[PDB]
Amino acid sequence: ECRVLSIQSHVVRGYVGNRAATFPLQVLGFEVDAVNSVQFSNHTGYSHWKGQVLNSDELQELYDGLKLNHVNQYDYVLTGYTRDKSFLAMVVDIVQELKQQNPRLVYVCDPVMGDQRNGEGAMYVPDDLLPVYREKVVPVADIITPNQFEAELLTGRKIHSQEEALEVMDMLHSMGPDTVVITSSNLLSPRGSDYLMALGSQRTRGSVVTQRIRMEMHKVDAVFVGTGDLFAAMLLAWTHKHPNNLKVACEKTVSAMHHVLQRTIKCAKAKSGEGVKPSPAQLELRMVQSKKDIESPEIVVQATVL
Amino acid sequence: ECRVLSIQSHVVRGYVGNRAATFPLQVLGFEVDAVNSVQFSNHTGYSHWKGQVLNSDELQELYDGLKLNHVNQYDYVLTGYTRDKSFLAMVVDIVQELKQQNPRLVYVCDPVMGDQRNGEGAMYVPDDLLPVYREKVVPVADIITPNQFEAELLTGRKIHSQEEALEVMDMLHSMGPDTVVITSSNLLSPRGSDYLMALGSQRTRAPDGSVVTQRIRMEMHKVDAVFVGTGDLFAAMLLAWTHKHPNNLKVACEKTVSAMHHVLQRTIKCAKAKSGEGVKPSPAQLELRMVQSKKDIESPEIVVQATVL
Ligand SMILES: Nc1ncnc2c1ncn2[C@@H]1O[C@H](COP(=O)(O)OP(=O)(O)O)[C@@H](O)[C@H]1O
Numbered sequence: 001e002c003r004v005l006s007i008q009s010h011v012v013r014g015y016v017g018n019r020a021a022t023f024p025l026q027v028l029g030f031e032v033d034a035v036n037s038v039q040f041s042n043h044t045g046y047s048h049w050k051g052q053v054l055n056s057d058e059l060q061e062l063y064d065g066l067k068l069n070h071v072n073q074y075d076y077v078l079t080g081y082t083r084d085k086s087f088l089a090m091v092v093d094i095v096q097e098l099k100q101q102n103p104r105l106v107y108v109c110d111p112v113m114g115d116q117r118n119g120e121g122a123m124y125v126p127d128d129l130l131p132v133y134r135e136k137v138v139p140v141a142d143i144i145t146p147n148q149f150e151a152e153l154l155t156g157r158k159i160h161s162q163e164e165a166l167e168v169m170d171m172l173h174s175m176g177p178d179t180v181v182i183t184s185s186n187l188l189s190p191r192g193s194d195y196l197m198a199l200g201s202q203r204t205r206g207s208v209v210t211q212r213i214r215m216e217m218h219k220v221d222a223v224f225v226g227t228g229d230l231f232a233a234m235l236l237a238w239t240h241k242h243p244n245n246l247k248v249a250c251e252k253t254v255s256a257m258h259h260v261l262q263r264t265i266k267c268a269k270a271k272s273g274e275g276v277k278p279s280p281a282q283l284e285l286r287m288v289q290s291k292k293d294i295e296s297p298e299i300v301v302q303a304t305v306l
Numbered sequence: 307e308c309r310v311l312s313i314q315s316h317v318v319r320g321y322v323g324n325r326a327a328t329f330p331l332q333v334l335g336f337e338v339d340a341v342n343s344v345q346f347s348n349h350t351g352y353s354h355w356k357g358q359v360l361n362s363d364e365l366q367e368l369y370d371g372l373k374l375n376h377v378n379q380y381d382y383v384l385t386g387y388t389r390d391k392s393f394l395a396m397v398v399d400i401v402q403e404l405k406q407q408n409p410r411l412v413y414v415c416d417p418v419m420g421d422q423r424n425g426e427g428a429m430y431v432p433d434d435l436l437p438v439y440r441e442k443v444v445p446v447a448d449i450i451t452p453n454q455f456e457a458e459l460l461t462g463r464k465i466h467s468q469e470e471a472l473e474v475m476d477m478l479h480s481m482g483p484d485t486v487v488i489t490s491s492n493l494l495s496p497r498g499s500d501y502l503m504a505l506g507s508q509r510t511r512a513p514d515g516s517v518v519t520q521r522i523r524m525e526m527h528k529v530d531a532v533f534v535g536t537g538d539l540f541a542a543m544l545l546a547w548t549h550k551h552p553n554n555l556k557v558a559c560e561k562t563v564s565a566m567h568h569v570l571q572r573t574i575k576c577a578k579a580k581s582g583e584g585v586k587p588s589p590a591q592l593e594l595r596m597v598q599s600k601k602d603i604e605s606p607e608i609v610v611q612a613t614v615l
């Protein structure tokens with residue numbers, strides 16, 4: 001049995017943060033302990049939203065409860081969007097302390113930054129977070145899933161080509177994480193302008209045998225929320241099964257992603273009218289109805305080894 | 307697609323309240339919208355626990371958000387443990403308003419107040435809740451799952467036999483709910499002193515004004531341990547199975563109780579293996595093995611047969 005401590009947002013309706021990460025990990029066999037950093041009615045993609053936030057002190061209280069009961073033994077820690085540097089700093093303390101009892105604990109981090117839609121009632125992420133991610137978070141993270149924009153901020157470098165991306169990924173490796181996956185980029189894929197390009201790199205430490213891969217997925221014509229959280233949660237599961245094969249781990253992860261999105265866009269267009277654009281409420285991920293696809297995804301993409 | 311609005315507690319670790327109700331409903335195909343009434347590190351069966359509570363105002367804020375976005379359309383509402391009458395009163399307002407847009411909404415309610423451990427009842431909730439459950443909650447509830455102790459408080463009547471239980475269940479039907487399930491009782495089962503007896507009753511008013519009532523009895527072998535979150539798990543699965551078998555309380559209960567059995571057996575086996583020999587399992591070791599019971603919850607092998615009364 002593998003136990004995951006996931007600390008992310010919670011929404012009453014829809015799927016983002018912990019809502020997008022718990023069901024997938026559960027059906028995949030993981031014991032998930034969920035700390036909801038916030039509780040909103042829905043995500044910020046809607047016109048309205050109401051809810052309450054948890055401060056670093058409250059986060060500490062919860063962790064203390066687990067500690068007092070001697071049940072603070074985890075195999076994985078998983079975090080994502082956060083817009084409070086004080087909260088984020090608290091997370092690092094918790095991870096460090098946990099890695100103390102279990103040097104084998106794996107910390108999966110998705111360093112969210114920018115004007116992204118989230119489930120924490122926020123319209124943006126304060127710039128004062130970059131230095132916390134850069135100097136405290138990344139150094140203790142084992143698997144990180146930044147997008148191109150985030151990868152650039154973390155390394156202070158810009159990416160103009162596939163070769164530069166690989167260089168930035170190497171810079172991230174030296175900062176700490178043995179596995180780095182750039183989930184989406186602006187790089188033009190050789191397959192076509194309609195494909196989204198993702199890059200992956202894993203340092204398997206004994207010299208460092210580095211496995212690098214590239215993946216191209218056809219873009220779906222719509223804006224989704226929570227996809228990044230779903231990605232990170234599934235990558236966690238699949239890397240656990242294929243600890244030394246980033247290629248397979250990413251192929252199953254991205255395949256699932258495809259099935260869920262296809263089912264989601266089909267149902268969204270069916271519920272809205274003819275020629276009517278689906279609304280964010282209609283675009284909520286069809287998580288429950290994708291159970292079989294998440295459990296065992298039919299591979300639909302092939303990762304090319306670089 | 308059936309959408310459920312579940313308003314119950316949340317624990318970081320373990321399974322109780324919303325943690326025990328969401329996963330089962332999700333694997334069974336239900337779209338679950340969860341409002342966490344509280345967030346604790348774990349349940350109170352542990353020696354320590356820390357967390358925060360939500361007040362009636364915060365509950366209202368959340369509901370308002372759904373309402374402002376016009377996404378307050380539900381098919382089911384599911385509630386359980388509550389320790390604040392103000393919060394409970396707020397729940398009733400929400401249910402009434404929802405039943406306005408959807409006359410077909412089904413409200414499943416587990417009126418938690420206490421249990422009868424050996425012979426004497428003990429209240430977990432302030433006594434000032436009983437009146438609220440009695441006059442405000444039960445009247446708008448469609449399915450209720452009280453234990454013997456709770457059934458007695460709601461009707462002000464004592465249960466000394468199977469016949470008296472059936473009378474109390476009829477009294478509850480008059481108060482509102484067409485479906486009543488007494489999940490556990492002190493009644494001695496004809497099968498043996500080691501079996502737990504549950505009773506079920508579902509009312510159907512025929513077109514001509516006649517009333518057909520299906521009544522059933524169920525006996526389950528006791529597992530030698532104290533579990534937490536089992537009542538929440540029960541109510542969540544009964545919701546799912548009654549949805550599939552709308553007019554057959556017999557089958558709905560057989561599938562529901564069969565799943566309970568599978569989950570508890572797997573849970574006690576793992577607990578004893580983790581404890582050590584001769585060592586009693588701790589509450590932390592007794593947390594329901596929810597995730598590892600996925601298959602059993604999806605399609606339970608029937609292991610109990612309901613007796614029609
Ligand atoms: N419109 C889309 N079409 C196809 N895939 C998408 C789309 N949007 C997101 N994804 C998938 O979601 C993941 C991207 O998450 P995203 O919201 O873009 O995260 P990030 O902003 O962290 O790069 C990728 O694996 C990608 O394939």
Ligand SMILES: Nc1ncnc2c1ncn2[C@@H]1O[C@H](COP(=O)(O)OP(=O)(O)O)[C@@H](O)[C@H]1O
Binds near residue numbers: 502533
């Ligand atoms: N020790 C046990 N042995 C067998 N079944 C149990 C045991 N404890 C709980 N259950 C199951 O859980 C449900 C009862 O929940 P329980 O803790 O007894 O709730 P309540 O006190 O509200 O009646 C029943 O369907 C019952 O079969």
Ligand SMILES: [Zn+2]
Binds near residue numbers: 110147228
């Ligand atoms: Zn992201």
Ligand SMILES: [Zn+2]
Binds near residue numbers: 416418453537
């Ligand atoms: Zn109960």
